[PDB]
mmCIF file of C-alpha atoms in Angstrom:
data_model
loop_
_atom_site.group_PDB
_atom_site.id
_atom_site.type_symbol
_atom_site.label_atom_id
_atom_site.label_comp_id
_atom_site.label_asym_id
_atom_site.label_seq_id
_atom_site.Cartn_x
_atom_site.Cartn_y
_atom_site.Cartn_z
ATOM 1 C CA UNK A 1 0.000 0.000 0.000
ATOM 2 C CA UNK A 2 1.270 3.030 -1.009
ATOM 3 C CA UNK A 3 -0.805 6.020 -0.179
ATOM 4 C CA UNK A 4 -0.839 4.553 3.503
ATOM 5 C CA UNK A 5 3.112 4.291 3.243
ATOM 6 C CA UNK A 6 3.345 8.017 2.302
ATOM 7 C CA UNK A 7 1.030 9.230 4.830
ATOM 8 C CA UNK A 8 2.657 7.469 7.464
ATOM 9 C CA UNK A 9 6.384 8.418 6.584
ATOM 10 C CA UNK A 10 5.060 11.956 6.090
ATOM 11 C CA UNK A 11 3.920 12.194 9.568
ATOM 12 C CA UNK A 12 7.777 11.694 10.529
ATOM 13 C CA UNK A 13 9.481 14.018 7.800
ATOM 14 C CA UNK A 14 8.059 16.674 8.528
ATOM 15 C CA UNK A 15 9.893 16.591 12.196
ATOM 16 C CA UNK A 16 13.033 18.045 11.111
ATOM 17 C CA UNK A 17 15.691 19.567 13.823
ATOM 18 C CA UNK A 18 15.442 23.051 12.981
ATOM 19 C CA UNK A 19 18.976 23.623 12.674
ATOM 20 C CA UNK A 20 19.243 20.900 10.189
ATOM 21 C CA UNK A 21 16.662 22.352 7.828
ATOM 22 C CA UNK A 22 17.797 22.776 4.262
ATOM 23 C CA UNK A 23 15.316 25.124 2.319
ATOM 24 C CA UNK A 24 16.435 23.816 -1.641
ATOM 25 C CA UNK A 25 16.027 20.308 -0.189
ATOM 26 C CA UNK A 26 13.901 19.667 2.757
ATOM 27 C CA UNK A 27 11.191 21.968 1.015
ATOM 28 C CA UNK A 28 10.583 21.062 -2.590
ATOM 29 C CA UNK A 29 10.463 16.709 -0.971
ATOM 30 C CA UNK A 30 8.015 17.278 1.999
ATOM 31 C CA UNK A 31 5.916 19.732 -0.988
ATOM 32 C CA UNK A 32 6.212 16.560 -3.365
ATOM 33 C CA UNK A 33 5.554 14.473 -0.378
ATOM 34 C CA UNK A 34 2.733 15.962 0.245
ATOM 35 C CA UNK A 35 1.441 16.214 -3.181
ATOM 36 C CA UNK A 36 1.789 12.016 -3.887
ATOM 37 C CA UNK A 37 -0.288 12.588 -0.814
ATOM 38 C CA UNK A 38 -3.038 14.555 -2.270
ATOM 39 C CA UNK A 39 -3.206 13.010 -5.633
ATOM 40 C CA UNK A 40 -3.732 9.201 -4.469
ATOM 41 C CA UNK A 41 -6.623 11.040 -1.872
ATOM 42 C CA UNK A 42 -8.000 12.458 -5.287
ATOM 43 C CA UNK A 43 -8.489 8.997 -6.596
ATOM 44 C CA UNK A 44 -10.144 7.671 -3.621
ATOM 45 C CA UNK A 45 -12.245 10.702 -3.456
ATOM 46 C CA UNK A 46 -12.894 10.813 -7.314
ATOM 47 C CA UNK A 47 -14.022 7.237 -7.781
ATOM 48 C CA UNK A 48 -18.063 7.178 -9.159
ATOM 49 C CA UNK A 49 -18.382 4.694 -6.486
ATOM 50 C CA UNK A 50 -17.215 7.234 -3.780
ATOM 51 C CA UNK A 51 -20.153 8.882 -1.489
ATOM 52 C CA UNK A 52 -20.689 12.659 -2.389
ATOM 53 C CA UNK A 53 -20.025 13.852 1.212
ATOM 54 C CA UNK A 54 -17.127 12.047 2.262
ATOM 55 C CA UNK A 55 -15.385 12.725 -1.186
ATOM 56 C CA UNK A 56 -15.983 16.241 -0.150
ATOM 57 C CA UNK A 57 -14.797 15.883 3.676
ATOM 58 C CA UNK A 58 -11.192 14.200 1.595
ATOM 59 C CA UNK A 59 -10.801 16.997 -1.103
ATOM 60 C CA UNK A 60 -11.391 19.849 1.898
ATOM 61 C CA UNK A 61 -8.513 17.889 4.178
ATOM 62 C CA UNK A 62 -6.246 17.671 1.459
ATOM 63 C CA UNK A 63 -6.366 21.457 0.807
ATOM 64 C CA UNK A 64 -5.898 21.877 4.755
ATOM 65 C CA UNK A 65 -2.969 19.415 4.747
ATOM 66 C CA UNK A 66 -1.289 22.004 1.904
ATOM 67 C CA UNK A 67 -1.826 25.038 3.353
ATOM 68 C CA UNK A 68 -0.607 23.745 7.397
ATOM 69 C CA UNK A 69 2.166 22.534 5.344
ATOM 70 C CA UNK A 70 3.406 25.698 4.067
ATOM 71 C CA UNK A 71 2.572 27.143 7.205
ATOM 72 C CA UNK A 72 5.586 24.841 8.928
ATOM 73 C CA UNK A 73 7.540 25.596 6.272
ATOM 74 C CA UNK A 74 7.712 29.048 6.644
ATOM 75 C CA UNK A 75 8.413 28.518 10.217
ATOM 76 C CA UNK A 76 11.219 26.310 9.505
ATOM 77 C CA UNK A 77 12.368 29.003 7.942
ATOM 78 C CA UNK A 78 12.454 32.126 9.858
ATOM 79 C CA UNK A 79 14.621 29.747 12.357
ATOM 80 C CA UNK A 80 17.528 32.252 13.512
ATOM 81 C CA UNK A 81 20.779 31.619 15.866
ATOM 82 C CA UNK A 82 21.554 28.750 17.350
ATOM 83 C CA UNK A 83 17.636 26.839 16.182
ATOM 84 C CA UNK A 84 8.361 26.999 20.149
ATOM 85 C CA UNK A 85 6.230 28.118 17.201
ATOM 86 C CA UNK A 86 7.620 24.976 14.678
ATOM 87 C CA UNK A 87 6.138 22.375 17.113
ATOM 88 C CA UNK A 88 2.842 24.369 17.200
ATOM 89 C CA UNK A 89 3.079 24.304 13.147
ATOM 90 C CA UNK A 90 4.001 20.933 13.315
ATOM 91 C CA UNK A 91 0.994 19.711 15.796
ATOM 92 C CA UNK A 92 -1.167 21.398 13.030
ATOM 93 C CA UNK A 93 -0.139 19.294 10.092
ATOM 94 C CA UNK A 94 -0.209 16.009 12.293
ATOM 95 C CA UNK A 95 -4.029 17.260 13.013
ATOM 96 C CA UNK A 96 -4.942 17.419 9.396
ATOM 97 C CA UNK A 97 -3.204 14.314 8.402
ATOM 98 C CA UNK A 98 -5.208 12.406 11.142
ATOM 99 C CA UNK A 99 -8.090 13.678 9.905
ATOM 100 C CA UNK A 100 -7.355 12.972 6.036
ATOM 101 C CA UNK A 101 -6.396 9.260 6.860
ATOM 102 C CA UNK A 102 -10.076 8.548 8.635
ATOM 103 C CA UNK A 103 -11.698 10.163 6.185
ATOM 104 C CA UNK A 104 -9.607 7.520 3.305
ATOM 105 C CA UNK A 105 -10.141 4.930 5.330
ATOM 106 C CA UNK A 106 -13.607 5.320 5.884
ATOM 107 C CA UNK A 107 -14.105 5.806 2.380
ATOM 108 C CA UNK A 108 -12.938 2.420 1.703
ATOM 109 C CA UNK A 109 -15.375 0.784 4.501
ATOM 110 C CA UNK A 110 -17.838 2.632 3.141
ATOM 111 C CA UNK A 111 -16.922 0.345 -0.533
ATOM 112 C CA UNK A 112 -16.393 -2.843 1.881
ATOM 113 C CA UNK A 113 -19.911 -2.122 3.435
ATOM 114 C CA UNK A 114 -21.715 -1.778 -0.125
ATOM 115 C CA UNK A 115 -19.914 -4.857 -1.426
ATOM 116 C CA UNK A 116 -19.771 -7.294 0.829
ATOM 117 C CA UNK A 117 -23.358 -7.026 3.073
ATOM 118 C CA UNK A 118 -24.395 -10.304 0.993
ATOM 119 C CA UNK A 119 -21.792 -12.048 -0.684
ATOM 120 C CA UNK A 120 -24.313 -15.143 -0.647
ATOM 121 C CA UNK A 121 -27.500 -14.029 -2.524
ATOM 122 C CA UNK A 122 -25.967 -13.541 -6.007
ATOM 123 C CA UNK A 123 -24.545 -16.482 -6.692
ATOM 124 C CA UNK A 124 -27.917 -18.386 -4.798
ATOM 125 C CA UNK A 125 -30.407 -16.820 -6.697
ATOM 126 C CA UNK A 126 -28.338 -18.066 -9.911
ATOM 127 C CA UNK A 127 -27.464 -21.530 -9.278
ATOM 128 C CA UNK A 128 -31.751 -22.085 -8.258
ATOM 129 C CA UNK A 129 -32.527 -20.128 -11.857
ATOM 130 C CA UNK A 130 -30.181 -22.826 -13.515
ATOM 131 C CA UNK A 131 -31.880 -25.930 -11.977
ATOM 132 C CA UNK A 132 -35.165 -25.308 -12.935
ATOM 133 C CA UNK A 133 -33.630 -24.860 -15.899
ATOM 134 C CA UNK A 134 -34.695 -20.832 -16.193
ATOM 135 C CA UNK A 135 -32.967 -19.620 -19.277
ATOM 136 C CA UNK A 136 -34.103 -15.738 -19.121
ATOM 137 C CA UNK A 137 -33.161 -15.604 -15.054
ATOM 138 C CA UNK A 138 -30.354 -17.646 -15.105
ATOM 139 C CA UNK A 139 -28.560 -15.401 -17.800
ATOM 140 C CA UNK A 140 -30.331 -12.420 -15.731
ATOM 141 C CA UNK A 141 -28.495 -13.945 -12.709
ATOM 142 C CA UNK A 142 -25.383 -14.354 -14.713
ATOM 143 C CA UNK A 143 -25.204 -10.867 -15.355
ATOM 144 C CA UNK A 144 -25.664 -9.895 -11.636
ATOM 145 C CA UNK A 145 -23.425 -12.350 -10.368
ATOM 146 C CA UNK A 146 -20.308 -11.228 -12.582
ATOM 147 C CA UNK A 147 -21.385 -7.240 -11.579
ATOM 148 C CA UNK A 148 -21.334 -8.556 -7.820
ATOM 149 C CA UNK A 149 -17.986 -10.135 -8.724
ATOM 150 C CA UNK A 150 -16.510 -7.118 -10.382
ATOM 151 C CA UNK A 151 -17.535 -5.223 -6.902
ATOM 152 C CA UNK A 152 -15.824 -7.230 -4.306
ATOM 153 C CA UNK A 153 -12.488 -7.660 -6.878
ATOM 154 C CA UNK A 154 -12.598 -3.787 -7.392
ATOM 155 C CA UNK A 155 -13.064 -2.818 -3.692
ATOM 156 C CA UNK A 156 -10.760 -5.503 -2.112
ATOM 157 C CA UNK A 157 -8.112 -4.251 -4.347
ATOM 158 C CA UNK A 158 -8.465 -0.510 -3.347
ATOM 159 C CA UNK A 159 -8.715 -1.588 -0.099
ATOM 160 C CA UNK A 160 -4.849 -2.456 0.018
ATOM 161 C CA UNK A 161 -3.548 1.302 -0.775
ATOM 162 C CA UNK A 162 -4.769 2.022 3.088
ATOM 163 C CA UNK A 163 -3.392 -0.932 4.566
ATOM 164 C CA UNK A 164 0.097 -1.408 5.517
ATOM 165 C CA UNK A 165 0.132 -5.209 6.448
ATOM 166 C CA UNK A 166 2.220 -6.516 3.813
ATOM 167 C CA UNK A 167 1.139 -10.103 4.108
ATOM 168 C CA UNK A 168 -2.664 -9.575 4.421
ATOM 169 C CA UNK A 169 -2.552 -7.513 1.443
ATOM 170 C CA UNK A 170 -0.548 -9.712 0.057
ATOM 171 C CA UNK A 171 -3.283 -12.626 0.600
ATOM 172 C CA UNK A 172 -6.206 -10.137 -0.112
ATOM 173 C CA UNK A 173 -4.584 -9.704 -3.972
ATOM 174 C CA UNK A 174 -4.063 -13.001 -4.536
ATOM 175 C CA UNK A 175 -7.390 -13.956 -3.294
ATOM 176 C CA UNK A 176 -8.759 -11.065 -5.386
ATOM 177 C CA UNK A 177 -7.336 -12.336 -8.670
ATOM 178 C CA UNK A 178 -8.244 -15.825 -7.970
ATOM 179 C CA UNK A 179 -11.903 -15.057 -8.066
ATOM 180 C CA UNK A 180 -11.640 -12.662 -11.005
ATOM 181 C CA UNK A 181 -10.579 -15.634 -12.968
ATOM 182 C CA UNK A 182 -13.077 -18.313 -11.359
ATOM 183 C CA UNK A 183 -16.404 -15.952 -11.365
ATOM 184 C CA UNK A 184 -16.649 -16.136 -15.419
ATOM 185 C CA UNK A 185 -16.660 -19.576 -15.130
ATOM 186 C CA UNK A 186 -18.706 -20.169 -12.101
ATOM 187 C CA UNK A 187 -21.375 -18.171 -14.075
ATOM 188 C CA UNK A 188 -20.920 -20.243 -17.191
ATOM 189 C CA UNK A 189 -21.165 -23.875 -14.868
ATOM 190 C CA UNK A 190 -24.415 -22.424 -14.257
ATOM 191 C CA UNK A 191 -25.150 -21.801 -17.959
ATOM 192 C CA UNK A 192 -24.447 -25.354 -18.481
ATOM 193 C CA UNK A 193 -26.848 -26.434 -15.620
ATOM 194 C CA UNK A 194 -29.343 -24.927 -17.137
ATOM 195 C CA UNK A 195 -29.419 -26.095 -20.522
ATOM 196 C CA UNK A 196 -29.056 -29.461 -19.163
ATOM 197 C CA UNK A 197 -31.140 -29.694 -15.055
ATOM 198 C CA UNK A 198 -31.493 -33.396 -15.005
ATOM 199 C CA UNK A 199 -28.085 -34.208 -15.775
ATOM 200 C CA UNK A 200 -26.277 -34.973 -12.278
ATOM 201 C CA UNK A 201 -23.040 -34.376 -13.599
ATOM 202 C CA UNK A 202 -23.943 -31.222 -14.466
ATOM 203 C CA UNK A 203 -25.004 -30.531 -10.634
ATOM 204 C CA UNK A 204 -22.165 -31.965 -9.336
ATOM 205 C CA UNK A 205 -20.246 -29.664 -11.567
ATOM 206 C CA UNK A 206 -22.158 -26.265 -10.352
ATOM 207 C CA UNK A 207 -21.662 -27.613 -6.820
ATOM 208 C CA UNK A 208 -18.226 -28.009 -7.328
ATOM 209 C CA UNK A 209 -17.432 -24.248 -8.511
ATOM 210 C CA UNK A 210 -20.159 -23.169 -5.802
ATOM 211 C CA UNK A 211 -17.877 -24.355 -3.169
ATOM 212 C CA UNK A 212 -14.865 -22.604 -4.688
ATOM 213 C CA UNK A 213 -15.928 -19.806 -4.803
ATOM 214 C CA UNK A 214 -17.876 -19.549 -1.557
ATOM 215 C CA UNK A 215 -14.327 -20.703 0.450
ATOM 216 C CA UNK A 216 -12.554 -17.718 -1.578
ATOM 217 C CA UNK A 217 -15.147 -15.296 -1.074
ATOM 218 C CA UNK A 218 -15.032 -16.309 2.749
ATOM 219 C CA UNK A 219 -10.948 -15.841 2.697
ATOM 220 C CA UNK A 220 -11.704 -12.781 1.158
ATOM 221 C CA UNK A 221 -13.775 -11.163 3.584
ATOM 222 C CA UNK A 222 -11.671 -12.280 6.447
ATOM 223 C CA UNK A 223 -8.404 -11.169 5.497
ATOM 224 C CA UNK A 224 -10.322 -7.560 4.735
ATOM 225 C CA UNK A 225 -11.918 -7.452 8.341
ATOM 226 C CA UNK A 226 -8.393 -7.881 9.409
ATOM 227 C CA UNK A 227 -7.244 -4.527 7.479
ATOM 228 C CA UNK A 228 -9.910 -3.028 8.821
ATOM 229 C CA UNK A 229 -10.509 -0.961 11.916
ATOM 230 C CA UNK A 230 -13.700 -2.280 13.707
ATOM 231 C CA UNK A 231 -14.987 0.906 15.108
ATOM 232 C CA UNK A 232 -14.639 2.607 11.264
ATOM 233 C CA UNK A 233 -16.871 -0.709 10.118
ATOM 234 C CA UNK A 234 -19.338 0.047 12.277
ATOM 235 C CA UNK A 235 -19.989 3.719 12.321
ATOM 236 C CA UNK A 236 -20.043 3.326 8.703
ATOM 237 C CA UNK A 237 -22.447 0.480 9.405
ATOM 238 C CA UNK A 238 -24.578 2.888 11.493
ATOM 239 C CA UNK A 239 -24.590 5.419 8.786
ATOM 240 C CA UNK A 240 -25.343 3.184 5.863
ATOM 241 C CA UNK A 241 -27.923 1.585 8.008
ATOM 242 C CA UNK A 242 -29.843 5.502 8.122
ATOM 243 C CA UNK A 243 -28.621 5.746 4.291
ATOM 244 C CA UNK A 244 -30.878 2.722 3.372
ATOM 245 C CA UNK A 245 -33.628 4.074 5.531
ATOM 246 C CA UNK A 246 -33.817 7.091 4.157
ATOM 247 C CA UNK A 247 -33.868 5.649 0.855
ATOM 248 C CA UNK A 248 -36.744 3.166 2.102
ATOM 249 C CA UNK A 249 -38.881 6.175 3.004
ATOM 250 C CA UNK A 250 -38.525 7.634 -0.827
ATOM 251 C CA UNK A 251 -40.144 4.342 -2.009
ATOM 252 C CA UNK A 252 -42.919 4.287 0.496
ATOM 253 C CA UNK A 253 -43.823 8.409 -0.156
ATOM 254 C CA UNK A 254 -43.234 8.228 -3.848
ATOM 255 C CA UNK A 255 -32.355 1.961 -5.881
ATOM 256 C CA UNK A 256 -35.400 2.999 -3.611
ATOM 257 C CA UNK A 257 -37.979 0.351 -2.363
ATOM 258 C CA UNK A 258 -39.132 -1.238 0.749
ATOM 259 C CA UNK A 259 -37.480 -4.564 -0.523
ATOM 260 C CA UNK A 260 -34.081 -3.563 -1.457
ATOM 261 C CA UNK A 261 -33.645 -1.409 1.661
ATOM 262 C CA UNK A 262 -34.747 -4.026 4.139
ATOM 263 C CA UNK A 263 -32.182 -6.087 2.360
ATOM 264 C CA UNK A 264 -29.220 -4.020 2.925
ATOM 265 C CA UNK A 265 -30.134 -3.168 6.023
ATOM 266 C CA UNK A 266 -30.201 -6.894 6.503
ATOM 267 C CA UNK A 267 -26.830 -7.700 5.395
ATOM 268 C CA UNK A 268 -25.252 -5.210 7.084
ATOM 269 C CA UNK A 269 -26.844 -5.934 10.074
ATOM 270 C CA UNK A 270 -25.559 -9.345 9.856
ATOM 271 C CA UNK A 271 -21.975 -8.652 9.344
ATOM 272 C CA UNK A 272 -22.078 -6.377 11.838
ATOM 273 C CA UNK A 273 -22.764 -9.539 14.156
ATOM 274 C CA UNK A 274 -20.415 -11.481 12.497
ATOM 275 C CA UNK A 275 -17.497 -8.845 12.711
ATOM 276 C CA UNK A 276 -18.439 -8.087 16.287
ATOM 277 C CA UNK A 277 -18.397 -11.467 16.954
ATOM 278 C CA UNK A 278 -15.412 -12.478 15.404
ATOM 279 C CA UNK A 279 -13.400 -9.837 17.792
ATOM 280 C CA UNK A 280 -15.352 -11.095 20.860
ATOM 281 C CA UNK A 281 -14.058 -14.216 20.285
ATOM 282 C CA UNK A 282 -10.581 -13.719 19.817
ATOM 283 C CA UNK A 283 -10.651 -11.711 23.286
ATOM 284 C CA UNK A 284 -9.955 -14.205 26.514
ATOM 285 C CA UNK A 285 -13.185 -15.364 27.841
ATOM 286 C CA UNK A 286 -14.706 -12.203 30.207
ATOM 287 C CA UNK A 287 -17.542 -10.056 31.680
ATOM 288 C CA UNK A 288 -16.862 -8.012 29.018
ATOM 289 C CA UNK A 289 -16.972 -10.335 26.111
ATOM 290 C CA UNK A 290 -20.645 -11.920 27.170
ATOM 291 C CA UNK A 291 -21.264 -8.726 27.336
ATOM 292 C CA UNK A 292 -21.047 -7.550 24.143
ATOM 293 C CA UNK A 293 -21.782 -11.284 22.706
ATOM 294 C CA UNK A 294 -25.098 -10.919 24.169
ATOM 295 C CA UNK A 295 -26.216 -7.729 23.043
ATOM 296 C CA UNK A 296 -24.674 -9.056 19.675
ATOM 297 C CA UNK A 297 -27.524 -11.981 19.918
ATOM 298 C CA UNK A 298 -30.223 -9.231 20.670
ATOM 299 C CA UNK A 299 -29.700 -8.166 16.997
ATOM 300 C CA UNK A 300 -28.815 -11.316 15.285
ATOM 301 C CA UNK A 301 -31.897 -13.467 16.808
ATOM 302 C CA UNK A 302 -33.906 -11.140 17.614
ATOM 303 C CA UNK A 303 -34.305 -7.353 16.255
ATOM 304 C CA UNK A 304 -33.137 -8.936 12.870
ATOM 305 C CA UNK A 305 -36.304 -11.094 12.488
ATOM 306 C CA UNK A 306 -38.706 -8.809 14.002
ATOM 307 C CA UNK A 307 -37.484 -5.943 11.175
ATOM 308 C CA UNK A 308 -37.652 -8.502 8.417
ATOM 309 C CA UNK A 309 -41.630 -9.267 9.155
ATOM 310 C CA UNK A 310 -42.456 -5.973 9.888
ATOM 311 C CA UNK A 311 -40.515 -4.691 6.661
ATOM 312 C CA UNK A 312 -42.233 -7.656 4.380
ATOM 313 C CA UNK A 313 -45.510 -7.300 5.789
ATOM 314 C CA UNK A 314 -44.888 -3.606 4.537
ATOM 315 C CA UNK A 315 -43.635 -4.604 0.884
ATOM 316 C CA UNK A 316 -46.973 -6.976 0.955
ATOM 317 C CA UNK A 317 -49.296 -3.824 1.643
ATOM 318 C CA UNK A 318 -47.694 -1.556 -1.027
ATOM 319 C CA UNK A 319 -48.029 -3.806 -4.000
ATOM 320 C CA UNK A 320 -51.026 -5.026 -2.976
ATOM 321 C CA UNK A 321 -52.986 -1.338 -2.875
ATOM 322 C CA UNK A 322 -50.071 0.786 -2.799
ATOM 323 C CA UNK A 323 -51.079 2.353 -5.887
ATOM 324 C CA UNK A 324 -54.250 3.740 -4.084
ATOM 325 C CA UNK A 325 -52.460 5.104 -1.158
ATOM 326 C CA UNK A 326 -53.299 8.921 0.196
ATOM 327 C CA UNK A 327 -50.438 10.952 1.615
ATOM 328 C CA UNK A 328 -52.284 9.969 4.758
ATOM 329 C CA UNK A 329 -51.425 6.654 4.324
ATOM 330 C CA UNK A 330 -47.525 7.423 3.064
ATOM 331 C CA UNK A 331 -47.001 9.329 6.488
ATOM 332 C CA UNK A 332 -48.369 5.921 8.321
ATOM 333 C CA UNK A 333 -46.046 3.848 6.323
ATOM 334 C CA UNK A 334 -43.413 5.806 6.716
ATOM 335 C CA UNK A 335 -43.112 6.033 10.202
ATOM 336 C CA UNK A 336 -43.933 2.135 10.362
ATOM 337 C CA UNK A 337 -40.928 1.619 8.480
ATOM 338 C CA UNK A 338 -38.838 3.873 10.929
ATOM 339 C CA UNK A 339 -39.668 2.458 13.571
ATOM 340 C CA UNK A 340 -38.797 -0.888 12.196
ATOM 341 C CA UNK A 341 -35.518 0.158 11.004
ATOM 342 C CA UNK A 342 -34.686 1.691 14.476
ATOM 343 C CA UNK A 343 -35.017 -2.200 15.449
ATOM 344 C CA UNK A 344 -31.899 -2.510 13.823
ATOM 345 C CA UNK A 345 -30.015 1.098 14.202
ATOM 346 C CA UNK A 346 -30.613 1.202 18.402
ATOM 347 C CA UNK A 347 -29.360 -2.401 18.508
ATOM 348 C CA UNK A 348 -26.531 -1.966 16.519
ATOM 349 C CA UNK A 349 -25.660 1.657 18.698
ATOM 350 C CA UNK A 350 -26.145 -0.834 22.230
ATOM 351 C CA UNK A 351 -23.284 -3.226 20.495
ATOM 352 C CA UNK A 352 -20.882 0.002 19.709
ATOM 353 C CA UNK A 353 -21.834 1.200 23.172
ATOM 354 C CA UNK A 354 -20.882 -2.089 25.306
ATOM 355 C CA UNK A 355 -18.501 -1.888 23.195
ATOM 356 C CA UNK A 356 -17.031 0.793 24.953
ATOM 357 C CA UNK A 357 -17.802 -0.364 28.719
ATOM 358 C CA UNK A 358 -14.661 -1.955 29.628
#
């Protein structure tokens, strides 16, 4: 990873002993430093997959980072005699380049929670299309599949310029490449099972690249919880979880429907267990641990469940006469929905917050 690398080294250069400072050298590096800096933010922050507000949060930090940096320059530089204002200047660059790396790395949770909130579905919903044998879903499926596998290539990949463990990112592209190559054929297998359903070897041949791909696509998402800084996962979680709700009312008063929403907020509510889980467990055996396991469970096998039935029982009523609802009607719809999602938001905001009582 090299934007990570650059930030990181940057944090040090720019601690200089003043009497050592060298104008026609320590100046035009640390300004070209800082540039490599700002230009791999830009491509974070410039990617059409990249939220509007956070891109803006990384193009405003980046123009902050610049201007503290010429700021400690010119300190440097007025540095007379034998050589308490540089540390000040020098506090105020660290600031901004804290702030610039949460707001990158953030940006690439928010990519890991898009991609990766149902890594199961896809491939499912293709592999029943091709046993039936469905022609016109299974090559529907197909073409979702190998979009969900272009996703979770794409964002494990730009998940490595933040991360400076060489040997899970090594893993992580590996891994990455690996299912690049095996998704065009896992979606052909299932073009093959579905010109021919009764033919056993042609299950046991969709089974076979089913299992493949499910053990990468497990690797996968390990090694990138393990680049990943729990508490960014899940106050992007949180966030995302509003984001879908929000886009679930737009669909009840007008990617916006009941369904689709309840299924993010689904997914993500589920790897939120799974991540939070996963840490628990690692952890010796405490107070704190059941702790936070059981509050964990309060989402997974309960608040999870209770949201899905409310939710469906909501998609149910708005194809069945949603086309002769009053605004009255909307408003009561709406705030059903809310309510159900805060199900899922308050439980997830109980796990961050036993989270926190150590």
């Amino acid at each position: 990873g090299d934007l990570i690398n650059e930030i990181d080294t940057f944090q040090n250069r720019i601690e200089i002993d003043p009497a050592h400072y060298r104008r026609g050298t320590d100046r035009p590096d640390l300004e070209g430093h800082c540039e490599r800096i700002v230009s791999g933010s830009a491509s974070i922050a410039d990617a059409e997959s990249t939220r509007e507000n956070r891109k803006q949060k990384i193009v405003a930090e980046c123009n902050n980072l610049r201007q503290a940096l010429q700021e400690l320059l010119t300190e440097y530089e007025k540095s007379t005699g034998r050589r308490d204002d540089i540390p000040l200047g020098i506090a105020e660059v660290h600031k901004r380049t804290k702030d610039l790396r949460r707001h990158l790395r953030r940006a690439i949770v928010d990519h890991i929670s898009d991609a990766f909130l149902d890594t199961r579905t896809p491939l499912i919903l293709l592999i029943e299309a091709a046993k039936e044998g469905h022609e016109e879903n299974t090559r529907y499926r197909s073409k979702m599949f190998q979009e969900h596998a272009n996703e979770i290539v794409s964002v494990a990949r730009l998940s490595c310029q933040l991360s400076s463990d060489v040997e899970s990112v090594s893993v992580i592209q590996h891994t990455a490449a690996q299912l690049e190559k095996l998704a065009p054929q896992v979606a052909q297998a299932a073009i093959l099972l579905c010109h021919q359903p009764t033919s056993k070897t042609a299950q046991e041949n969709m089974e076979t690249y089913k299992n493949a791909w499910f053990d990468k696509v497990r690797l996968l998402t390990t090694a990138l919880d393990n680049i990943t800084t729990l508490d960014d996962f899940l106050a992007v979680s949180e966030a995302h979880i509003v984001e879908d709700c929000e886009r679930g009312i737009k669909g009840i008063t007008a990617c916006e429907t009941v369904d689709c929403a309840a299924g993010s907020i689904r997914g993500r509510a589920l790897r939120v267990c799974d991540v939070v889980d996963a840490e628990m467990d690692f952890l010796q055996n405490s107070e704190y641990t059941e702790t936070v396991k059981q509050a964990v469970r309060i989402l997974k096998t309960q608040r999870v469940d209770q949201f899905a039935e409310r939710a469906s029982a909501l998609a149910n009523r708005q194809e069945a006469h949603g086309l002769t609802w009053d605004p009255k009607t909307k408003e009561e719809e709406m705030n059903e929905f809310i309510n159900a999602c805060t199900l899922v938001h308050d439980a997830v905001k109980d796990i961050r917050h036993a989270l926190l009582m150590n």
